Design a protein around this ligand. Structure first.
Ligand SMILES: C=CC(C)(C)[C@@]12C=C(O)C(=O)N3/C(=C/c4c[nH]cn4)C(=O)N[C@]31N(OC)c1ccccc12
Ligand SMILES: C=CC(C)(C)[C@@]12C=C(O)C(=O)N3/C(=C/c4c[nH]cn4)C(=O)N[C@]31N(OC)c1ccccc12
Ligand SMILES: Nc1ncnc2c1ncn2[C@@H]1O[C@H](C[C@@H](N)CC[C@H](N)C(=O)O)[C@@H](O)[C@H]1O
Ligand SMILES: Nc1ncnc2c1ncn2[C@@H]1O[C@H](C[C@@H](N)CC[C@H](N)C(=O)O)[C@@H](O)[C@H]1O
Lengths: 394, 394
């Protein structure tokens, strides 16, 4: 047979493993994870591997059900087992459904099938209980997955032309709410604000904030100029990072603006840590606080297309700047023009469903020129997916 | 670090590989594919691996869009490349959308990113163009995936109780058609009949038909008794298999019954190969042809719950039998009670969305007793997922 295929792929895994296990602080790790995948695919063969999409779908379905139904929380941590019966008992999910669902997440899924109707946690299932995953994953599976699946349906309505807008997209199609942006439609139900703000807090790859010199720029600023605004700062974790990074400071104003339901959830937590909670909308208003150090956008612009909303953000902010004292900092993923990762692809293509997108370097170039903005410098410590786009008035 | 984790998992892959590469005609292969997956998961780590559900989702989305938009067919086979521009040109899918979508299916996806806006087929993407995958995959992604994703939503409506029925399920919820069974709602639009009949024809794991002695049983039958009926035979590929298996025959009637839109698509193809195309409905009618060799159900019962429809099938067929001359053959997956595969899980849990299910041996036991039917013998050549349930009147 073509068992030969397996050998070559095993060899490469073995090879790539050896490399990974004697480098330092990267390409090695990614390459090995890639050669590891090739093996699985090669073992299965092209035709059986095409069935992976169906397998993948039920697994995401069943994981989502199980997590919502309280199964992850009812099951004992540390790998102690529990029965179908005892689980169903504590959650009220149909023991027959639960048994069937479990089959999707034991054979390889993050659970362990100890024995007949007997299941256990592993660290991979327990990872779904951590702040990052537990804040992120439910929101995505309740509100985003179904839309991403309907991308095909939306573009088919336009004979594969790009009709996507912020208010007419696979999200509005799937949740039947044409005209509303994703945020608008979620915040209308107030029960959603807390989960969504937690999801907005999720930072799985640990964003690097020592990427650009805060201490230097902010404390070379005299008086009213010395003040940073985290626009759409949400929680404010970005601000707190910055503040931690430079305490080499005087009395410096630190403001976190965002919509009202967001400002509610985090306000007095922010007053506490010493930050001004300001309610602001960069779509219906011009930027209030004038002539500041820098106006800082973190994981904001990828929510938006270049026009209309993209230009209006930067235009409503040009209003309150200073030709040479203020500066603008966009902090977001910079997609390579070749060799994108699945980390790149899943964030970008999810946004696609709500009319957002992740931007190339040349994509950020277009955005700046459109708003008559001059690129000062792009900060990136490569081996790191996010850079900062620094810019000024032309 | 815990680079140790990678080593142990590499070792096991290497080990399981060596075993697989000196067995014969199985557990070896599955175990290696399992240890291969562990490695990928271990390399990524529990928290980053939880993000695999999001990655998996966009990949299925983007594959579905690309295949529908005609990209798989526009691209040259054999690994010759083609540009974003030349592809968009031949399909009219937005070159900007196409570029973004491609990122989900190059890094590991079945395509190869030759260079900037330059992509190529590999045998893994070309596999999507084969009869099995190309008949199966579109139907699933258009009609089934979205429902499977909404399993959680449906059961949440019932506080995780099992409300699922053949006409009230995640399918009726997602496609908004409460009251219709999956088949009813698809056949209402006649453009769907041809794709769905091709999907029904899909047989990816190559079902074993030499599993039970046709030559022996059929040709020990005198006269009007000697006649087999493939109920819901669709295409009739099952019948043709059987006929090929025994030509050691006299003039033996071979009938393939199914609903009308199915009988249309395949009728004169079946008359041709010498088979009686009969229109029949085992929900609204009793079984016409009386006292036959055997009544044969292939990949039928997993479309149905035990009651109502399950019992009514066997009851409408008991009508036309012979206490000791006729026999009933259910041919379907037999789920193990432990160590289910993802192959088991994806078929069962998809059905779950339309109120169907795959059955245990003890599950088939319940079904038989409920219809007052006696188990003669279960045929299985293990290492093979499907058996036959042979049964008679009690
Ligand atoms: C789900 C709601 C939001 C959290 C608001 C989110 C919006 C953001 O602006 C954002 O930063 N996000 C995430 C960051 C992250 C990075 N590592 C772990 N989490 C994230 O998962 N989901 C989102 N995201 O991004 C891919 C979305 C995609 C489609 C709709 C909405 C969003
Ligand atoms: C999609 C429509 C059907 C083909 C009618 C199908 C019904 C069957 O009875 C069947 O046998 N099927 C398949 C067999 C197969 C085995 N290996 C490759 N294909 C299959 O994919 N899809 C289905 N299937 O089963 C998991 C479904 C699941 C949910 C709804 C409908 C179905
Ligand atoms: N019209 C709007 N005006 C101002 N902020 C908005 C608007 N729409 C959405 N947002 C906020 O943009 C933020 C997007 C967040 N994902 C980013 C928050 C934060 N900068 C972070 O990096 O995590 C949310 O907090 C939104 O509430
Ligand atoms: N009420 C019904 N009565 C008779 N056949 C039905 C009914 N509903 C669905 N079917 C058929 O059941 C079959 C299910 C197929 N997946 C199986 C066909 C074939 N036995 C095979 O193994 O591939 C389809 O051909 C349906 O048209």
């Amino acid at each position: 047979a073509q068992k030969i295929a397996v050998q070559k792929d095993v060899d490469e895994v073995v090879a790539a493993a050896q490399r990974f296990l004697h480098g330092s602080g990267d390409e090695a790790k990614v390459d090995l994870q890639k050669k590891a995948s090739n093996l699985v695919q090669t073992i299965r063969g092209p035709i059986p591997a095409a069935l992976s999409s169906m397998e993948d779908i039920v697994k995401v379905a069943s994981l989502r059900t199980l997590f919502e139904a309280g199964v992850f929380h009812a099951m004992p941590k540390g790998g102690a087992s529990m029965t179908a019966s005892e689980i169903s008992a504590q959650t009220g999910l149909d023991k027959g459904i639960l048994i069937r669902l479990m089959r999707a997440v034991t054979p390889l899924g993050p659970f362990h099938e100890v024995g007949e109707e007997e299941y256990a946690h592993t660290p991979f299932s327990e990872a779904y209980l951590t702040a990052d995953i537990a804040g992120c994953f439910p929101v995505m599976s309740n509100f985003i997955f179904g839309p991403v699946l309907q991308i095909c349906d939306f573009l088919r309505q336009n004979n594969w032309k790009d009709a996507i807008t912020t208010r007419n997209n696979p999200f509005t199609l799937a949740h039947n709410c044409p005209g509303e942006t994703m945020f608008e439609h979620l915040y209308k139900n107030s029960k959603n604000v807390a989960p969504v703000t937690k999801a907005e807090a999720a930072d799985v790859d640990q964003i690097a904030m020592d990427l650009y010199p805060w201490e230097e720029r902010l404390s070379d600023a005299k008086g009213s100029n010395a003040t940073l605004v985290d626009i759409a700062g949400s929680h404010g974790n970005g601000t707190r990072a910055i503040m931690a990074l430079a305490p080499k400071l005087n009395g410096c104003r630190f403001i976190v603006q965002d919509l009202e339901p967001v400002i509610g959830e985090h306000s007095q937590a922010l007053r506490a840590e010493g930050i001004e909670p300001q309610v602001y909308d960069f779509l219906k208003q011009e930027q209030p606080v004038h002539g500041a150090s820098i106006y800082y956008f973190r994981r904001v612009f990828h929510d938006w297309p270049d026009l209309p909303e993209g230009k209006k953000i930067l235009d409503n902010t040009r209003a309150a700047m200073s030709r040479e004292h203020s500066r603008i900092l966009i902090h977001d993923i910079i997609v390579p023009e070749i060799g994108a990762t699945m980390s790149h692809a899943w964030q970008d293509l999810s946004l696609m469903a709500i009319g957002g997108m992740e931007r190339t370097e040349k994509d950020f170039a277009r955005l700046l020129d459109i708003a008559g903005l001059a690129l000062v410098k792009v900060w990136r410590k490569p081996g790191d997916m996010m850079g900062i786009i620094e810019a000024r008035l032309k």
